[PDB]
Amino acid sequence: MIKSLFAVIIGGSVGCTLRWLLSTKFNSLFPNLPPGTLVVNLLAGLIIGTMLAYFLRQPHLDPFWKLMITTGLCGGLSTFSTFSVEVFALLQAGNYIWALTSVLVHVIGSLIMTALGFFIITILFA
Template structure:
C-alpha cells in the first residue's frame, strides 16, 4: 500500500508542476479563456486515455505504474478546481458566453481526447 501512495505522490507532484508550467506559458491576463488550463485538461485526458487503454492490455505490469500515471500524474496535471474558478470569474465579469464556451471546450475537449487516445491505443 505504501508503494502505491508513494507512486501517486510522485506522479501527482510531477503532473502539478507540469500544469503550473503550462499555465505560466499559455495563460495571459488579457485572454477570455484560460488556454493553459484547457491545454492541461485535454493533454491529461489524452494521457489518461492512453494509459488506461495500455494498462487494460498490459495486465502483467505492477499496478503501481497505473496509479502513478492515472491517479498521480494525470490527477495533478488536470484541474477541475481551477477550471471551475475560471468559469466563476468569467460569470462574475458578465462574460456568460465565454464561460459557456470554456465549459464546452474543457468538458467536450477532454472527453474527445480520451476517446481519441483509446482509439489510438486500440490501433497499435
C-alpha cells in the first residue's frame, strides 16, 4: 500500500526524467512531428508490449516490479498531453497535414511498437 506507492514513484521518476531528457534535446530538431515525444511514446509502446508477453509467461512476478515497470516507468515515460498540445498548436498554426500525420504516427506507431514487443517475446519464449 506504501511499498506500492514507492514503486509508482521510482518507475515514474525514471520515466518522467527520461522523457524530459529526450524531449529537451531532440524535440526542436523536427517541429512538425517532434521526435523526442514520438520516440518515448514508441519506446513505451514497445516496452509494454514485451510486458504483455513476459507477464503472461511469469504469473508469479512480484506486483512491486509489475507496478514499477507499467504505471511507473511506462506511464511516466509515455505522454498524451504533450502529444496533445503539439497537435493543438499545429492546428492553431493552420498546419493540418502535420496535425493529422502526428496523430496517426503516434497512434499506429505505438500500436505497432506494442505489437512488435509482444510478438517478439511470444516467439523468443515459445
